[PDB]
Design a protein around this ligand. Structure first.
Ligand SMILES: *[C@@H]1O[C@H](CO)[C@@H](O[C@@H]2O[C@H](CO)[C@@H](O[C@@H]3O[C@H](CO[C@H]4O[C@H](CO)[C@@H](O)[C@H](O[C@H]5O[C@H](CO)[C@@H](O)[C@H](O)[C@@H]5O)[C@@H]4O)[C@@H](O)[C@H](O[C@H]4O[C@H](CO)[C@@H](O)[C@H](O)[C@@H]4O[C@H]4O[C@H](CO)[C@@H](O)[C@H](O)[C@@H]4O)[C@@H]3O)[C@H](O)[C@H]2NC(C)=O)[C@H](O)[C@H]1NC(C)=O
Ligand SMILES: *[C@@H]1O[C@H](CO)[C@@H](O[C@@H]2O[C@H](CO)[C@@H](O[C@@H]3O[C@H](CO)[C@@H](O)[C@H](O[C@H]4O[C@H](CO)[C@@H](O)[C@H](O)[C@@H]4O)[C@@H]3O)[C@H](O)[C@H]2NC(C)=O)[C@H](O)[C@H]1NC(C)=O
Ligand SMILES: *[C@@H]1O[C@H](CO)[C@@H](O[C@@H]2O[C@H](CO)[C@@H](O[C@@H]3O[C@H](CO)[C@@H](O)[C@H](O)[C@@H]3O)[C@H](O)[C@H]2NC(C)=O)[C@H](O)[C@H]1NC(C)=O
Ligand SMILES: *[C@@H]1O[C@H](CO)[C@@H](O[C@@H]2O[C@H](CO)[C@@H](O[C@@H]3O[C@H](CO)[C@@H](O)[C@H](O)[C@@H]3O)[C@H](O)[C@H]2NC(C)=O)[C@H](O)[C@H]1NC(C)=O
Ligand SMILES: *[C@@H]1O[C@H](CO)[C@@H](O[C@@H]2O[C@H](CO)[C@@H](O)[C@H](O)[C@H]2NC(C)=O)[C@H](O)[C@H]1NC(C)=O
Ligand SMILES: *[C@@H]1O[C@H](CO)[C@@H](O[C@@H]2O[C@H](CO)[C@@H](O)[C@H](O)[C@H]2NC(C)=O)[C@H](O)[C@H]1NC(C)=O
Lengths: 210, 210, 208, 210, 208
């Protein structure tokens, strides 16, 4: 009743096509990843599988409000009417967005203006290994991701928590048959292409056979 | 008279906010699962998964969809499900799922004069099952099926089994070629994450290798 | 909202259904690709898969805006509102774009009217292993593209850089053969619908 | 010129989500099929392929008209607006409603109010198979179908011709390679469901292994 | 300039849900197929995979324009705003229009009214296989081209060009089979609902 008047106000003058602060500050996207189940590593295809709750958060100065509630747990139909980052996995092969009774998305707009847009995904990506030591080896499967259409001067990715404590694997989340997930290591990074210097969040999964 | 019915159906959809859950900003609304298991289709010890076809039915009491003139349980078309609020219930251990679209999308919208919305889905889930291959003739699996909301904390909605033990129907009428259902058990559970706490209904059952 | 003013003003009176130089010029398009990976050459189905960043560049005189910003960077939301040329890979079995997490479509608009547009595309093309000598293999593996509807009178494809124009990556991209170089051509192929320009890209491989 | 103006007279005031006769007599849908081919049986996962022309007919008195043409042969784009029933196959585990240039659906509105509506389908229905006699098999694979959301008090399925003649297989079309089609057998039953009571059209196909 | 308002008046008041010459003579639809590949003639599944440039040309009096002495090759987002015939394939199992960069679909209007249509379709078509002679047998796997909801009192099919309506077959090479001959068949097919026209394209496959 009252909240419909709020949400009908927050789209007058709003534009999908513009990041928050165009011609201004860069936008800082706080990326969090919760690994639901690290799936089976396909050795002949040379690619692994991982199920993630790919979280990301940023501040928009156009979605502020002074309603009775602080956080409005809205629906995923709302998220197609606000700006979202264009993150993509640089080594991803066949990444499916999980669609169900509703699409598995989320949007919790806050009276501060900060957002929270998480997605349930299955991204499969390249993990090149060296079979010089075939029965017993350990190598790191990379998971790189970053923006597609926005350079480092438009968007800048960050980690939500500390980088040692951002990517979280689940307790029971291991669909592995041959290997042992033991630890992960992230860093930031800049990969320059023919357009510009894009920021790339690299995540390695160190794992060894049995 | 069909002319009186269209005036009420247009009245329920004029002023309706699809992006707001019922009693938004108030008490959580209870959504009750009802599962009619059609078949266990393809359980496979190669991909660690099993294929489940069922009638996923769910009911919730919402306030905005109530009427006084019609004594009937008003069953509308399934394209009204694209016009109303339905929960974003997902299955956490699915690998590939789909709603059957043989003639239409197999959805049921049955309104009530009280305000109870009944929502059915003939969906086929390829859920993942972590199977212990310790001893092969006596496998004795426990393959689960986890019902959980995505974008709503436990103070936004809440789940239960609509009928206690009788919410799950048809498992005794399953004839598997190599397996035998000896038990099935419904577990209600609450699970917290960094984002919030989430209600979790668990449908699990034991298999046996012949 | 000053960019919202000049972005909305490029949309009224703009028909998505017509190419820009509809009667005057053949609407030349500059193109290039970044070869991100070349997957396994199966050759039983005569198929190899390839991941590229396929980019296009053309001039739309209907998209000239006055110099307030030099170039405005757009997301994947304004590609459906602007004329985008059809381009199909002629030898592709299943050329599927990447749609995950607000799809891989990049769009830039300068005040000249120049439009930069790129895609992330995985392909699987036609390439016979040429099995005269099965240990001593040689291969050509073409990758050619054209417009499906617009002939050489109405569309013209051209490389940006003369005779190479195609980047590459670190050669650890799952190739069981020896990737030895590039070469590209430009051919006018006569069909029934008209005469179409064909932009062949060759990936020379050999087994070792 | 004229026929554009008469389609809008039939669709203005017509509600797309209300069956003809809500609060009135039960909608009588008349079902015909035409088996274009009986596809190859699968002894591994106990199923079969079949592609039919699945015909339906019901009287919508809200669509009567007076014009120069006797019947109106219209596109499938017209059929998305008119109420059509939700006829799903109870045995179908995967189905393809075929579309090639348009969706393969014809809608022929007669002058009286009745209307024919058919679609070209493919049903991967499943056989509960008895392999006690594996070289000398004699099966009867069902093809149950009925409504999804509408009760027996809301829609009732009937056969168009005599029920022995209301199922037609093509004379020169069958993709069987290990079996052969002895003949067809229809039946009409009622499934007592947890939601209500549903009419179910059953169709059997009698097979024997060569 | 002038062209944009002529395209907008052809789409103003246009009723998609009625065919050309509705309540009158049958609209005459001519077809042409450019065969691209005979990819996977599977002997186990008894099917063959066909890639084809499916082309349709019909006369439409509602889409004629006076001036503009050229052909209007429009964008592919107009075919869902125009009438197209509901031509299916009788023996398909899996089929799709290619979506390489955008959907591969051609609309080319003409100043008289002859709408030209095009698609790039990969069709997995099934066919009867007689495995009595297990080597060196000919298969004669066909492709029944038929419309769904239009009786012969509403449409007419013909091979546009006669014998030269099917091209590109002689350039196909298969590793196991070999194209020995093809022929085009026009007929009428009676059902319970009506009488529908059927085009049939045959391929005899002399196995090496
Ligand atoms: C037989 O029937 C089936 C089922 O009905 C048809 O399949 C559907 O076809 C339609 C028409 O093409 C598709 O709709 C369009 O989809 C575009 C992308 O959708 C993606 O959806 C998910 C992820 O969201 C992916 O899984 C999909 O991938 C599948 O489809 C591709 C297609 O080639 C396959 O190759 C794959 O293998 C997958 O199977 C899709 O990639 C979507 O962008 C588009 O929506 C825009 O355009 C329409 C009209 O213009 C408007 O809804 C709207 O304007 C959208 O534009 C917004 O977004 C764009 C983004 O760039 C902006 O530019 C705009 O400004 C605006 O903001 C449209 O919805 C549908 O996805 C598809 N479904 C499936 C399951 O395949 C067959 O086509 C049909 N066959 C026939 C008729 O021959
Ligand atoms: C993921 O799952 C979601 C389920 O919530 C699904 O969203 C739905 O998608 C369909 C399209 O596939 C939407 O339906 C559209 O709704 C608009 C509303 O006005 C209609 O105008 C559209 O009509 C078009 O198609 C009609 C077909 O009969 C024709 O009349 C005509 O050609 C129109 O162009 C269309 O019906 C539906 O609204 C959403 N539901 C939501 C967003 O809640 C989504 O598509 C799934 N994604 C996949 C499968 O990739
Ligand atoms: C398959 O395994 C799962 C877990 O390994 C089994 O689920 C467990 O079921 C028991 C029995 O109900 C649960 O214990 C009780 O739960 C209730 C309701 O939550 C609570 O009130 C009790 O205090 C007690 O804790 C247990 O929680 C549950 N485990 C999980 C993780 O949910 C399941 O029963 C097994 N399948 C079969 C067929 O036995
Ligand atoms: C084997 O392939 C041949 C062609 O390669 C096809 O035979 C065709 O079969 C159709 C229908 O079975 C027939 O066409 C007829 O053509 C006459 C004119 O010649 C026409 O008046 C009829 O109405 C009919 O359409 C004919 O037998 C033959 N046609 C041609 C041109 O060869 C078919 O695909 C396969 N035939 C067999 C017997 O397996
Ligand atoms: C309309 O729906 C209501 C709600 O399900 C029906 O009421 C139930 O009827 C069953 C009879 O099978 C009783 O066992 C339940 O106790 C009733 N529940 C409630 C809350 O009343 C009602 O019968 C339906 N009426 C019609 C005409 O369909
Ligand atoms: C527009 O398309 C029409 C239809 O094909 C063209 O008319 C024919 O063109 C071919 C080859 O150019 C020739 O047979 C004749 O010139 C035309 N035939 C007839 C019967 O008129 C027309 O040339 C096209 N217009 C342009 C500018 O190319």
């Amino acid at each position: 009743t009252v909240f419909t008047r709020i949400l009908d106000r927050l789209l007058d003058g709003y534009d999908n096509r513009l990041r928050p602060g165009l011609g201004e500050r860069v936008t800082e996207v706080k990326t969090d990843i919760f690994v639901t189940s690290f799936g089976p590593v396909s050795d002949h295809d040379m690619e692994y599988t991982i199920d993630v709750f790919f979280r990301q958060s940023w501040k928009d100065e156009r979605l502020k409000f002074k309603g009775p509630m602080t956080v409005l747990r809205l629906n995923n139909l709302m998220a197609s009417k606000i700006w979202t980052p264009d993150t993509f996995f640089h080594n991803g092969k066949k990444s499916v967005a999980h669609n169900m009774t509703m699409p598995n998305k989320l949007l919790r707009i806050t009276e501060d203006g900060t957002l929270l847009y998480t997605m349930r995904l299955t991204v499969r990506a390249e993990c090149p290994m060296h079979l010089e030591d075939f029965p017993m080896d350990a190598h790191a499967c990379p998971l790189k991701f970053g923006s597609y259409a926005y350079t480092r001067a438009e968007v800048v990715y960050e980690w939500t928590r500390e980088p040692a404590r951002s990517v979280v694997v689940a307790e029971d989340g291991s669909r592995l048959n041959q290997y042992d997930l033991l630890g992960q290591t992230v860093d930031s990074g800049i990969v320059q292409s023919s357009t510009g210097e894009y920021v790339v969040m690299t995540t390695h999964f160190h794992l060894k056979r049995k | 008279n069909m002319s009186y019915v269209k005036e009420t159906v247009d009245r329920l959809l004029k002023g309706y906010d699809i992006r707001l859950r019922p009693d938004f900003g108030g008490p959580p609304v209870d959504v009750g699962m009802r599962i009619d298991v059609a078949s266990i289709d393809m359980v496979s010890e190669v991909n660690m998964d099993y294929t489940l076809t069922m009638y996923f039915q769910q009911s919730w009491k919402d306030k905005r969809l109530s009427y006084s003139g019609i004594p009937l349980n008003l069953t509308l078309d399934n394209r009204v499900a694209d016009q109303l609020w339905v929960p974003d219930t997902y299955f956490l251990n699915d690998k590939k799922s789909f709603v059957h679209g043989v003639t239409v999308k197999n959805r049921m919208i049955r309104l009530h004069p009280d305000g109870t919305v009944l929502y059915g889905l003939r969906i086929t889930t390829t859920a993942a099952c972590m199977m212990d291959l310790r001893r092969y003739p006596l496998d004795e699996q426990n393959c689960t099926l986890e019902i959980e909301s995505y974008g709503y904390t436990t103070d936004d909605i809440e789940f239960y089994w609509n009928g206690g033990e009788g919410a799950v129907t048809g498992v005794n009428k399953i004839e598997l070629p190599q397996f035998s259902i000896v038990d099935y058990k419904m577990v209600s559970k609450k699970v917290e994450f960094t984002t919030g706490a989430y209600p979790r209904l668990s449908l699990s059952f034991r298999l046996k290798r012949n | 909202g000053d960019v919202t003013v000049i972005l909305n003003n490029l949309l009224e009176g703009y028909d998505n259904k017509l190419r820009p130089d509809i009667g005057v010029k053949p609407t030349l398009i500059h193109t290039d690709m970044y070869v991100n990976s070349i997957g396994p050459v199966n050759a039983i189905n005569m198929e190899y898969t390839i991941d590229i960043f396929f980019a296009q560049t053309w001039y739309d005189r209907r998209l000239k805006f006055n110099s307030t910003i030099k170039v405005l960077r757009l997301n994947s939301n304004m590609v459906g509102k602007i004329w985008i040329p059809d381009t199909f890979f002629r030898n592709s079995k299943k050329a599927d774009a990447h749609w995950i997490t607000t799809p891989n479509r990049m769009l830039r608009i300068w005040n000249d009217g120049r439009v930069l547009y790129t895609l992330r595309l995985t392909i699987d093309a036609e390439c016979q292993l040429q099995l005269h000598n099965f240990p001593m293999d040689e291969h050509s593996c073409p990758l050619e593209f054209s417009s499906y509807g617009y002939p050489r009178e109405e569309i013209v494809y051209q490389w940006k850089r003369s005779s190479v124009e195609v980047g590459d990556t670190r050669s650890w991209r799952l190739y069981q053969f020896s990737f030895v170089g590039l070469r590209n051509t430009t051919e006018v192929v006569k069909t029934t619908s008209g005469d179409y320009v064909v932009m062949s890209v060759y990936f020379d491989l050999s087994r070792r």
